[PDB]
From a paper:
N-acetylphosphoglucosamine mutase (AGM1) catalyzes the interconversion of N-acetylglucosamine-6-phosphate ([name]-6P) to N-acetylglucosamine-1-phosphate ([name]-1P) in eukaryotes.
We also determined the crystal structure of AfAGM1 in complex with [name]-6P and magnesium, showing the typical four domains forming a heart shape found previously for other members (domains 1–4). At the active site of one of the two monomers in the asymmetric unit, unambiguous electron density defining a phosphorylated Ser (Ser69) was present. The dephospho-AfAGM1–[name]-6P complex has an overall structure with an open active site and may represent the inactive enzyme or ‘apo’ like conformation. In AfAGM1, the magnesium ion is pentagonally co-ordinated in a square pyramidal arrangement by AfAGM1_pSer69, Asp284, Asp286, and Asp288.
Residue numbers in the entry: 2 to 14, 16 to 20, 22 to 105, 109 to 405, 407 to 541
């Protein structure tokens, strides 16, 4: 590598230790913010290595703990196309975080064949967290020691940062993603939303809970750029970004999804169309209060079916339904009714994949148009190289033209790099405008099987080894046989159990034709899992 550089890395590394042991995973490095200096430093070094390995391409760093409380923070790497860090590279981060101050960077330059000829290039941003300023200061020191070029994008949503990274590495290519600034992002979405909305009108207000996080001021700033006669009026609530303690506190998409209620502080009336973003605004879900005051959730799987229905219809009327392979990508947690709706009502393939955004993104990129959402409200619609060409180059034999126009627009509206709450929100709004649907008519599209999720503490969960999109247990022996036996005893009975990646428990999900059936099925399986976890 270099000797004078290797002395600057060792010297600047001055920070803690702090003796806990780390692992970069699904969520990158994510912990209490006080444990994090040596780790963010290491990611500075790892961003440098990654940039150089990929011929001095821009690598992103996002500083965020997402839905976690204020005391928490995290750090994530973004690869050139705006994808999360390639899986094989997570271990490199791990080695660098644990490995003691004083150098070891050098050992990886040899191991990963990395060219010194290019300077590393790295963009970063952060959410509203209290530790962000100091953590960025750390990141800067690591990128000064390795003589990397870097740009501080300051405060951004997670999807904005991914946007920038994609833009920077696609400028001058055939598939230019846009202007690599915050301004660029808003401009792209506003112009796409004007096109997608041509001749159609939003009805009623949308009350968006912004989790008191970065998504609130960024949404408000996007609203300045949006066009005029769309009918869209957004009411922003929970934007107390000023107070670090307010982040994700009894509001946000994660609260609303996991607790199955509107935020306590919500002032929405009966029939007000509502949504919640998470803290870093890459998760959204809709909800409304019944004509009879019952809370009604329209989660990621519900956005997935809404999107697929709309995209299905457009591809048809655009005359390209046959040329392009369209699909919905789901996990096992997707309500069986959602799957049934996709396959029997929309006549589209559903692919079930492992839990984890990587796996859903990967499966979606196998369709020309791949809709993938998790229930928690993370997801997007993937457009393939092939999809983009045939939308841009099919000649309309009918005024079809309108539909192609609408579809081209959608490719610009829908964030391709990462699932994006603000993007998804405008998507939903555009769909319900085009379809002329209320929240009530969206909900009425099919009925969810009553379902139950349970968290089952065992010691230890590593004996729970699954396959077939995590819908079957190979280990421990006999448990799947019991689970299969149990589910049969109930009408439309479906249940599966898997180790959590993020928590120390196995999760049981169950659904059946009725509330008491689902509940009892879930409990029997939970009991069976506890016995098997002894
Ligand atoms: C960025 C990413 O890949 N996130 C995944 C998410 O896709 C998955 O739904 C969740 C499942 O959690 P679990 O293993 O505890 O059920 O874990 C992670 O947060
Ligand atoms: Mg998030």
């Amino acid at each position: 590598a270099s000797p004078a550089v290797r002395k600057a890395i060792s010297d600047a590394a001055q920070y803690a230790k702090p003796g806990k042991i780390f692992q970069y995973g699904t969520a990158g490095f994510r912990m209490k913010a006080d444990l994090l200096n040596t780790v963010v430093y290491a990611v500075g070094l790892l961003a440098t290595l990654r940039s150089k390995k990929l011929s001095g391409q821009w690598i992103g760093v996002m500083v965020t703990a997402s839905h976690n409380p204020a005391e928490d923070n995290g750090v994530k790497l973004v690869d050139p196309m705006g994808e999360m860090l390639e899986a094989e590279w997570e271990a490199y981060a791990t080695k660098l975080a644990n490995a003691p101050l004083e150098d070891v960077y050098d050992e990886l330059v040899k191991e990963i064949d990395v060219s010194m000829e290019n300077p590393a290039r790295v963009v970063f941003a952060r959410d509203t967290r209290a530790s962000g300023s100091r953590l960025i200061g750390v990141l800067s020191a690591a990128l000064t020691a390795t003589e990397a070029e870097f740009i501080d994008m300051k405060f951004m949503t997670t999807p904005q940062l991914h946007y920038v990274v994609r833009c920077k590495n696609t400028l001058g290519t055939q598939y230019e993603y846009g202007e690599p600034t915050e301004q660029g992002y808003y401009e792209k979405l506003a112009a796409a939303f004007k096109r997608v909305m041509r001749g159609v009108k939003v009805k009623g207000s949308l009350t968006v809970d912004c989790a008191n996080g970065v998504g609130g001021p960024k949404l408000r700033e996007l609203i300045k750029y949006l066009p005029e006669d769309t009918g869209l009026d957004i009411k922003i609530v929970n934007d107390d970004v000023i107070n670090p303690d307010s982040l994700n506190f009894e509001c946000g998409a994660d609260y609303v999804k996991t607790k199955q209620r509107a935020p306590p502080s919500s002032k929405a009336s009966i029939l007000d169309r509502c949504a919640s973003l998470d803290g870093d605004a890459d998760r959204i879900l809709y909800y409304f209060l019944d004509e009879g005051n019952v809370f009604r959730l329209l989660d990621g799987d519900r956005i997935a079916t809404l999107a697929a229905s709309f995209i299905g219809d457009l591809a048809r009327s655009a005359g390209i339904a046959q040329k392009l392979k369209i699909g919905v990508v789901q996990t096992a947690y997707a309500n069986g009714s959602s799957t049934e709706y996709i396959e029997k009502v929309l006549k589209l393939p559903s692919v079930c994949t492992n839990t984890g955004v990587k796996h859903l993104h990967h499966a979606a990129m196998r369709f020309d148009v791949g809709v993938y959402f998790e229930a928690n409200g993370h997801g997007t619609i993937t457009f393939s190289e092939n999809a983009l060409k045939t939308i841009k180059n099919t000649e309309p034999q009918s005024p079809q033209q309108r539909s192609l126009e609408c579809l081209q627009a959608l490719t610009d509206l829908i964030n391709q790099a990462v699932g994006d709450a603000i993007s998804d929100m405008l998507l939903v709004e555009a769909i319900l405008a085009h379809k002329g649907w209320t929240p009530k008519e969206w909900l009425a599209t099919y009925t969810d099987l009553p379902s139950r999720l349970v968290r089952v503490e065992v010691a230890e969960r590593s004996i729970f080894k699954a396959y077939d999109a995590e819908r079957k247990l190979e280990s421990p022996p006999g448990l799947q046989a019991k689970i299969d036996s149990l589910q049969s005893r109930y009408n439309k009975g479906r249940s599966f159990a898997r180790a959590s990646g993020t928590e120390d428990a196995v999760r049981v999900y169950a659904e059946a034709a009725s509330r008491s059936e689902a509940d009892d099925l879930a409990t029997r399986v939970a009991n069976a899992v506890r016995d098997a976890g002894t």
